[PDB]
Amino acid sequence: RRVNALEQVVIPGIRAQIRFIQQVLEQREREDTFRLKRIKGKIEAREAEEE
């Protein structure tokens, strides 16, 4: 009973939690990349005001 309980309840919940945390971290990384791209564009556009 203990073996079946572990293999049928405990492991899949931990796997789902791991997947959820990975998705959240990846989304935050993508948002950071977008922000850095925007401010790089701003920096490049600043120098072109008067050449």
């Binding site: 009973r1 309980a5 948002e31 922000r35 925007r38």
Partner: protein, 578 residues
Amino acid sequence: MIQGVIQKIAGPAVIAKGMLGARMYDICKVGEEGLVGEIIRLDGDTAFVQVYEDTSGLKVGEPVVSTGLPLAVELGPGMLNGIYDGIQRPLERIREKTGIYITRGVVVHALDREKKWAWTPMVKPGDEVRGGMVLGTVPEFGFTHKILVPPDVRGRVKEVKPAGEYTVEEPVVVLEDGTELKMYHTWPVRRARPVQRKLDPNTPFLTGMRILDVLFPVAMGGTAAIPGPFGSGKTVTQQSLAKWSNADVVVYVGCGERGNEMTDVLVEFPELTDPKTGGPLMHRTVLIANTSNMPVAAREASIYVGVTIAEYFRDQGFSVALMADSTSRWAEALREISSRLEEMPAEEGYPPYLAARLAAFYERAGKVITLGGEEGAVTIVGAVSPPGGDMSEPVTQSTLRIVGAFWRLDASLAFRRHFPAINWNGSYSLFTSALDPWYRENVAEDYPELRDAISELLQREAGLQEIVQLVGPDALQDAERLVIEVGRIIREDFLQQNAYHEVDAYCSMKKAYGIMKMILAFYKEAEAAIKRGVSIDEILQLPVLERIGRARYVSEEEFPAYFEEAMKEIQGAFKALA
């Protein structure tokens, strides 16, 4: 007026030039087709306009004309029994011009200018009027529509038209300074209508559902939020509230959802009867429909139009219930507009001012004393559609800070056809304490004790559910098995409610009270009989258990006799038992 030309087109965003003198948040007319747009940014000689219609086919150089006024709705007689677009256009007057399809550019007045209304004056020359006072009355479908002075008007009365039949655009009262008061007036949708004072909500809002009326009540000026994943039952719950509640006027806002859910309401409502006046159900309902395939920028305006109309009906003394079908679509529209403006997002792409907008929308609800000296109320029930059932998303978390009740739906119950599928462990209500004096005089004097006892039984069963899942139901003793079976009886016979059944769809307070009393009487008798060595098997096989299960299908006119017979049978069958 201020007049210019189009400089740049990109989706629903149009940049006009030559617009020096235009004001923020005004209404502009874009292009030769006469589309409707709103200023949201001024920059030198240019202006940023978001268009509420389809922008395909526009060309650079078309004129833009600024009307100089903000977005406003027309408030007056003729709004009931109506279906409106996102910017208050009558759909039935559009179909007669354009066919089965919706084409941009069609302009129709919101209030019909050809109908004649019976006029009855109540003021006399020489009187002085203020904002919110009543000038006269006009009959509607059972109601008595009152003609109100606009909130910004003050002066003395010079001449009043006598009784008769007039259109909505004929002046009825002329003041001393030459101001003419008609049967209708316009109000900006982004300004809350003024009131004298706000009162503490103290009377319940009866929804007709047992779980929402007993366990998690909502008052007559409160706000409630019902989040859940797809297929949970938000729309069915809101439509049952529209069908069976005790509100005088119901305003339904279909913000960004399916078109079949509006056709069902338009078709089935005229054949139903409202609970309090006996007339057609559609005679008290106002629909604002903006489906998912309509222009996105019109989703934001529909919420403000609906809440402004609901506030207008509040000023006449009625009790108005407002149902917003989805606020996440409004959040998506805000995200789209912010992306077009190229603003920096806060979380999930949403603009950082979303919580302020949500708090400004929900704050318009409440029980007030109107400027005319009457009492009115507005209740708001908004539904949230979180992506994938995640309750940590920004829209859900920004709503929990202002609402007074939180009805959480569950996918596990909805998958097993256990409706209304309300999670009774994650839900709460903050109006329970204030509504107790009403219950102590309007249903019975022992109602709160009964409700608390049943809540305690549910808590005990939920506690035992951890034990039973690892040892099985047989290994528990009789005192625990009794609690398990009683909790199952409560779950399958009291909380569950079919919204499509002929009788079970609506439940009064006294019927639920009687079911509660019967269940607890059975529990007490079984608890007494357990100590005499009687087996659980002998108790669970008793025929009186089926009387509890079938109790919710008895009509209201036959319930007290059934209740008396069931109580006598409960008190007798255990006496017959050993």
